[PDB]
């Protein structure tokens, strides 16, 4: 109900550690725009 692309991530193997290291961990995502970005029709923002 979007008509947009999507991204997903899957466990291929699983995480393997030696003795004496933390068990769980984390991933972080960063987003940005590439040089070819364009905008039109200045309007008012819906946040204030």
């Amino acid at each position: 109900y979007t008509s947009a692309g999507n991204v997903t991530c899957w466990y291929q193997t699983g995480i393997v550690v030696p003795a004496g290291t933390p068990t769980s961990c984390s991933i972080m995502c960063f987003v940005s725009a590439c040089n070819d970005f364009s905008v039109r029709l200045l309007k008012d923002t819906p946040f204030i």
């Binding site: 109900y1 200045l42 923002t45």
Partner: protein, 222 residues
Amino acid sequence: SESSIENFLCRSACVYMGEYHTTNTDTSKLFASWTINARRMVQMRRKLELFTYVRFDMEVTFVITSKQDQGTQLGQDMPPLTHQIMYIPPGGPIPKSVTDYTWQTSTNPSIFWTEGNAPPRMSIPFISIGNAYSNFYDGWSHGVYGYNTLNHMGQIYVRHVNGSSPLPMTSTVRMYFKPKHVKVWVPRPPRLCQYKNASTVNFTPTNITEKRQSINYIPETV
């Protein structure tokens, strides 16, 4: 091209609306006044806070409308009304009555206008002994936190230009403000919380964003 700085900031807006009478028993209702800053217009404030330093000229247009008070007396035949719009630079005398001497000082620029004509308009340059204005100040005034005196931009005052013993009338002024020839420095993150008052950055803690169902949830495709 529409994301340039000029096309993003150089746009007109109503920032103050005020009322004033020709006769009254309060004597502060006989004139209207406004201090120029860009912190009591919430939509312009937020667009201006994306930068730390700004430099611009100001353009101000005035829309003025009058009315006879519903008190009692009819059958009048009146000429059109005249108004005086005075700008006070930083470091100028401020009037306290409508009969004061400061409404005649040679260094306060002033506009005289009569109804029926095109709306009046004046243009103010960049007025600061510093090199830019600042939207954020992490300091003390000399003591108020966050307030520096280089940001003074002046004031506007409006009155009627009648003679002695005038007839009762009520006027409304709307001021439209527009910055021009704009330059900005040091971008900042956008304001995430609602504004609380006009002089501080005070806020109540806010959520980072809204929730969804789970970290895997993507809505069904049409």
